[PDB]
Symmetry: C5
Subunit: 307 residues, 5 copies
Amino acid sequence: PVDVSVSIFINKIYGVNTLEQTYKVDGYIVAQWTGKPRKTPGDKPLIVENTQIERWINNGLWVPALEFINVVGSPDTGNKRLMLFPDGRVIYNARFLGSFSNDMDFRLFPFDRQQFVLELEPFSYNNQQQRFSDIQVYTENADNEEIDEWWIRGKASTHISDIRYDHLSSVQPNQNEFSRITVRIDAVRNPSYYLWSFILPLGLIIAASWSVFWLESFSERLQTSFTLMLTVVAYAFYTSNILPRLPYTTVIDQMIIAGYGSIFAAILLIIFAHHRQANGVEDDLLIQRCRLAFPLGFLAIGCVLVI
Amino acid sequence: PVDVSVSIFINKIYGVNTLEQTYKVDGYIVAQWTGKPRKTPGDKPLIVENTQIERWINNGLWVPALEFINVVGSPDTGNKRLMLFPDGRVIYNARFLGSFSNDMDFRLFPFDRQQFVLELEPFSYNNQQQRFSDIQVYTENADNEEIDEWWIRGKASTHISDIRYDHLSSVQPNQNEFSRITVRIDAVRNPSYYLWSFILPLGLIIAASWSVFWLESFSERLQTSFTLMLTVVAYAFYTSNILPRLPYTTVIDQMIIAGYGSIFAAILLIIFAHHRQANGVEDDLLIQRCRLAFPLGFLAIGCVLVI
Amino acid sequence: PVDVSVSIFINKIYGVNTLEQTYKVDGYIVAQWTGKPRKTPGDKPLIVENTQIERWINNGLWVPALEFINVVGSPDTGNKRLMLFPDGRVIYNARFLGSFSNDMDFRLFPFDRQQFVLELEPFSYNNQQQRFSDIQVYTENADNEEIDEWWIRGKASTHISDIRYDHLSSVQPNQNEFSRITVRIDAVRNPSYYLWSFILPLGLIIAASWSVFWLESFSERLQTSFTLMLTVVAYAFYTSNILPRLPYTTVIDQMIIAGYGSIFAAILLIIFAHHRQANGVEDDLLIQRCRLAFPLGFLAIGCVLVI
Amino acid sequence: PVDVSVSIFINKIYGVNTLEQTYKVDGYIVAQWTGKPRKTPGDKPLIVENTQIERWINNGLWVPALEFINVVGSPDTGNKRLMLFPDGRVIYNARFLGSFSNDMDFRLFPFDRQQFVLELEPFSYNNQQQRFSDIQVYTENADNEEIDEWWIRGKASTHISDIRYDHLSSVQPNQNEFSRITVRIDAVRNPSYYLWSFILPLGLIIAASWSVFWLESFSERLQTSFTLMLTVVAYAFYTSNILPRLPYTTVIDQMIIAGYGSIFAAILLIIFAHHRQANGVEDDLLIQRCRLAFPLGFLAIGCVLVI
Amino acid sequence: PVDVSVSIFINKIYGVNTLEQTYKVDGYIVAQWTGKPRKTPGDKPLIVENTQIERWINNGLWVPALEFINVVGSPDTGNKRLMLFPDGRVIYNARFLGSFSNDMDFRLFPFDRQQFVLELEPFSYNNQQQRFSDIQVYTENADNEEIDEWWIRGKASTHISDIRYDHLSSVQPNQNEFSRITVRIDAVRNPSYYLWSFILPLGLIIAASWSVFWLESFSERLQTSFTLMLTVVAYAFYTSNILPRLPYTTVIDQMIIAGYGSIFAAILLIIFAHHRQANGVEDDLLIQRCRLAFPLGFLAIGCVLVI
């Protein structure tokens, strides 16, 4: 059971893919273990650089393949180095950029918060053959968050576990568990742009829609209702052209639907108010009371919506 | 006739491209067979990792090439391993990400349901030379479907078959059959987003369009009809900018066309009512009757559509 | 002069790029010739798979390079095999996916019809050194055309030709000709989507635009004309955001221009009728006349255009 | 100083990237020089194909690296061949597809005209070590200009020069010169599409905007002005969504700004006419003057700006 | 401590990605150091080209791997050469294209100013093993800035520093410092396009929106306000579809929000004027006053909001 100590440096996380639930991570990976002692040039450690590494494998060196479980396709392995010590220690250091997978819930967008995970596991060697001892994940402070799309909330959380693959061969008695490293980094989306350039104008438009009941004529009210409908449609289009593709309704989508329904209920109430009573009465109490009740009814419906 | 037992682990299915009829599949592939026995270091099984694999082949090891039939270009094979047992067993294990093709019908979108298929076949060796014994496909449960784009409905269906290529050589007596593994996985699209953010606003706009006959003046009616047409145009624009490119009409496209035809028929009826009777009679009976005859008749039209 | 018999299996054609005039083609390529006999294990033919291929070339085996002339960049070569027969026969079989070029005229879109071409030619060896004997192009029937964007109409047309590169050396007497295989596949675009969601709504919008002359007042007519102009603009925008990039006007672009001109001529005719006569006359007869002359006149203009 | 004669075949130029000032070039490159004589298999010249080339380099063959200076990243080198003659001649032939950069000015778009340049230079050897003797550039006729986006004006123009890199070491006396081949191909953009589907509808919209002064009432004029503003806005959006991204104002952008300013000046003139006279006399005389003075000053500006 | 002198030639900077804070840089990298003398053919230095370089490493040539710190994934290594001198000097020259990251603040867009940085560092060798001696950064003048997207303001600033990695082993006394080269290039964005086609039309639209108070009727004012709102919505749509994605509000976004607020305050003031005094007195004094307070107050608040 070989003891392996790892350390993963994280340079950047970016490239959010909402539909595919992937994210790009660039950083470093260090893995250290202890092998048979060896003679080096002098007693100083030996340095082996990318191509030369393969040579040592062809001559019998054991370098285990550590696979990113949650990765998406072969990542872009940058420079890689082996440091070989005379006492047998071996250190594998590699720059890596890769697309990783994780369950991501975007329903509370733009106020969502996610957690980027990394999953390391030996590809061929089990835990009875090769064991994980140490994890250390370092994230740069970068406290000037205002510029970045995402805000990291705390340093990385680690988790070593043992994964049991049930569905395997039947001649292998007990060598079916593997040592898996899982790294989690919580982060929150910066909603400033969506607050100011999406939410605030939408609320202003809906308030303007409420301002329809201050028209004197019925024809004016009903005709302007369609201008309001078209306004909401154009705004929803601008929205959808900017916002990311998704298979569920975002919060902004819900505000859009709320504006649609408010205008629809306004049209219904306008028609009803004009054609309610007898003796050619428009029920002036209904119109001039709705002129202030409609904002409060909608605000109560929205405070119930946030639940 | 070599008996090969395979096992395909499916990690993720995503990236549907509607125009190309492709979908990306990331997972593992395992293949086991029995060859001539071999001496290993001790009687313990030997493990060979990516680069060294090629070396063993150059010294005479026979590793057959298994091609994904329905694949699109060279897939991205990640880490790969050979496990060699002293009794002759050989196991090939490889991580793979690839884009696959299949007939996909999106006419009932966004309520469509598809089936992702995989087709494995030996590239050069026929069925009289190399045979498939077992198929085993494992899919993760992933029971929090509400977030995922597609909902897997059931376990995978497998089928070993014999494929016969007619157009071949003329010296080949009986070596013209191949062993093909076929895996099918049914799936259904999540229609929530298109129901709430597309279907509901489209229907609400169509109802608001119906509300034109409740106008008193004729000029108001005809002038407002054009604002309604422009609303439907902007809505169809927003729709088409979001929805996937396709060569046929989706259900939503049909609803857009239905809104167009509804407004056009409304304009025709408005003109008819204004100039049906003599001496400039409005024919208010027609206007009042269609005020509620358009909804029932159009729902009947859509019902005869759906069936 | 080596006789080479080829066979090209065409699995799928897709991914047309209008601006680049490229299209993606995935299939197989087979090339067969007869060489000096060779010793195999037994008298059964020998099979060589991807990597080992290079070894055989390095030991003196002659494998000619066949270049796709009309391809765009290095294609994605999948699995490849060499079949070596004891009598000297050699068969090269390779899976290939590539982007190919051909002159493509999209003026009649969405009613255009194109033909996908493939051009094979030996890269270095001339016709006095290497000759093409047979071509056979196989495409699966796939008679369920309704799903696919393009409809293949008949089997591929083949043509062996000899191409003479003029600009060559001046000491070379006659070794300047090459054997080129040309494959052509005619196909027609499925216009259903563009028929129903583009052409039909456009005609409906243009007829509704003509319906402006049924307004009683002049001011109503002129004010509504601008709502119609904006409607056409929004429609052209929807179109252009959806339709493929091109450097020339499609049929749909001309229909957009036709709607533009119809609305503009309508505005011109409205002003003319308002100010045709002296003493504040409206020339209502002109409005009544154009009310039906615009359908007839514009459809006569469209039918003269379609000749 | 070795004399090297090259030959560049140009198959296609496409894929202009406006922001990056890049263009895709697909063609062939041939380079010939004369070396020490050599023994061939038989007395006929020997042909070496892609993979074998590297082997021949390891055995002492001198093949200089010729770099495309203005290229962007590693181009896609397809098949490459060495033709070795017994008299010592060496010919390197390779298919190449690459993205190239050059100063491109798009200010007069869609009436712009550009020139595609290619820049070849030996990577390691100077002019005293390796010299360019001949250039021969072959460009396809492509006389079906109506379909192609760009019109080539003439065959390629070439220019060999010697480049001196100032910023270098101080021990190198005069070996700081390199032989650079420069190929230039002038071309003019076909403006038909942008003329008919962009310029003409925009001018028609602006003329309709001029038609505001023929409204009788003041309220009609001022209220219609805002729908006209909205029309220009929607058109400008359609424009910018189709037209290529750029860091400067195109001619079409200038026409958009001209329409905007025309509508704004129209609003100014409308309000001025309404309140130029005391007691708010409408001053219809000003409207009757400006209705045909405004297009006059506009088209005067349109002819002036051309200078 | 090996002294290494570098030289970085910068060919082009482009491809700014606002969300990822990356930019593509193409140029050359030169590295010079002095090793033990060597026998060459003659006294002229020996030149080694790309592939052969790798061979020389397997036979014992020491070429240190220098990594770009701020790069994103393996850069696109073009041609590379080794020049070996008899006096012991060794020079590595390589063409490179890569994606680089740096803190980039786009808040003052379109007047933003950024700085493109490059960070060079040895991958495996520390400063006691390998040191940087000289920096020389050469940038082409390119003084025709008007065409290019970005304008470089001054020549590059260079800086050698020593970077200390804390998290390392604990037996290593002082081998925790590395020699880092830092290159900074200030640059300013070309605002012409965003000035003329975005800022100026937006200001004209806002002034036109102010021109609503010159309407005589109350209904005219209130109904026209909604057309103005819709105009602002379409304009914001056009902007956001063209402008680059960002997580914060640009200056242009602030102007859009300001137009929104102007229209909303105009509606508020209209309603207030309609119901300011008893009996729904319209308060013509309020309209007179606001006709000049709204523009002047907007100028004052806009001048306040920038300091």
